[PDB]
Nucleic acid binder design. Structure first.
Ligand code: NA
Ligand code: NA
Ligand code: ZN
Ligand code: ZN
Ligand code: ZN
Ligand code: ZN
Ligand code: ZN
Ligand code: ZN
Ligand code: ZN
Ligand code: ZN
Ligand code: ZN
Length: 260
DNA sequence: TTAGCGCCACCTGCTGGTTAAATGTGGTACTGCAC
DNA sequence: GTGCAGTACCACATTTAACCAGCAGGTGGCGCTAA
């Protein structure tokens, strides 16, 4: 039961080899064998093996059910959870199960904690929680475009999407449509079409029970509902101080406020 | 002693489905004015 | 009062990007063995 103990820390190990290796990890901090490619070194030979494999790209073990070959056995074991499911880790609050420990840690941090430090965009004012989400934001909004992208409503050309969106947000209080015969302007195409119809005098809309024609659909609907609906009675608003009748609402107030 | 192996975690990073905020559409009242 | 013309609400349908769980690559720590 742990014959050996580390003098400089609290760890106790059964064998001399295990305690020595623990001393290598935390106390000796030596680098006898490093990689032939870079300056990285390790304590165990298998760590240098997998580092060399990452340098070269060798995948020893292949998945039984899929076409994935892993450089390490633990990678294959974790991959097997894709086919088997079997989410080991469980949240202690919402009791949700997750396949990887990091997934559970991120879930608990971002779903059951209020004050969590967040990342700030180096180029814009947006604030994001996850660094991966920040990378997506940078790669989408802040990416550079060689060919550029013209503004939707002007001849301005931008290379960063964030700049393009910020420019296009300045055109949301503008009447692009302008009549060629007068100074009238509007924001929706239907209004411009109606104005040009009034300019030309065209009345495309026609009543189906009379000879009358209209320049707008709403006008024809109101005429039909008035002069072709026997069971219709107009709304009459009565002054509360004198009693005389008024049809439109605003006129009734115009009389009631000045009535005696 | 010592390399090998197995397990486990930690750290980092990418990626599609989900969803909620933002935004564009169009039906339908709603007034100003000329008659 | 009313019809025409232009405007104003606003419920609704897209649009878009953060949210989030699902994944994989590189490294650090430990417990035994057989070699
Ligand atoms: Na409109
Ligand atoms: Na996924
Ligand atoms: Zn120690
Ligand atoms: Zn190396
Ligand atoms: Zn598989
Ligand atoms: Zn949870
Ligand atoms: Zn940004
Ligand atoms: Zn513009
Ligand atoms: Zn005009
Ligand atoms: Zn009619
Ligand atoms: Zn009155």
């Amino acid at each position: 039961t742990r014959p050996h103990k580390c003098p400089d820390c609290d760890m106790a190990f059964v064998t001399s080899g295990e305690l020595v290796r623990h001393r290598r990890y935390k106390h000796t901090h030596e680098k006898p064998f490093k990689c032939s490619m870079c300056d990285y070194a390790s304590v165990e030979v298998s760590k240098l093996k997998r580092h060399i494999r990452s340098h070269t790209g060798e995948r020893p073990f292949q998945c039984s059910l899929c076409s994935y070959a892993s450089r390490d056995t633990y990678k294959l074991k974790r991959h097997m959870r894709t086919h088997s499911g079997e989410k080991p880790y469980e949240c202690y609050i919402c009791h949700a199960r997750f396949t990887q420990s990091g997934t559970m840690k991120m879930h608990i941090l971002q779903k059951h904690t209020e004050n969590v430090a967040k990342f700030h965009c180096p180029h814009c004012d947006t604030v994001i929680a996850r660094k991966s989400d920040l990378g997506v934001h940078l790669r989408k909004q802040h990416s550079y475009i060689e060919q550029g992208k013209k503004c939707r409503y002007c001849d301005a050309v931008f290379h960063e999407r964030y700049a393009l969106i910020q420019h296009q947000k300045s055109h949301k209080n503008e009447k692009r449509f302008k009549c060629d015969q007068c100074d009238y302007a509007c924001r929706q195409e239907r209004h411009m079409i109606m104005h040009k119809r009034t300019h030309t005098g065209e009345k495309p809309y026609a009543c189906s029970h009379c000879d009358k024609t209209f320049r707008q659909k709403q006008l024809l609907d109101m005429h039909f509902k008035r002069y072709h609906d026997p069971n219709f009675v107009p709304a009459a608003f009565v002054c509360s101080k004198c009693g005389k009748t008024f049809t439109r609402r605003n006129t009734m107030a115009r009389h009631a406020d000045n009535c005696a």
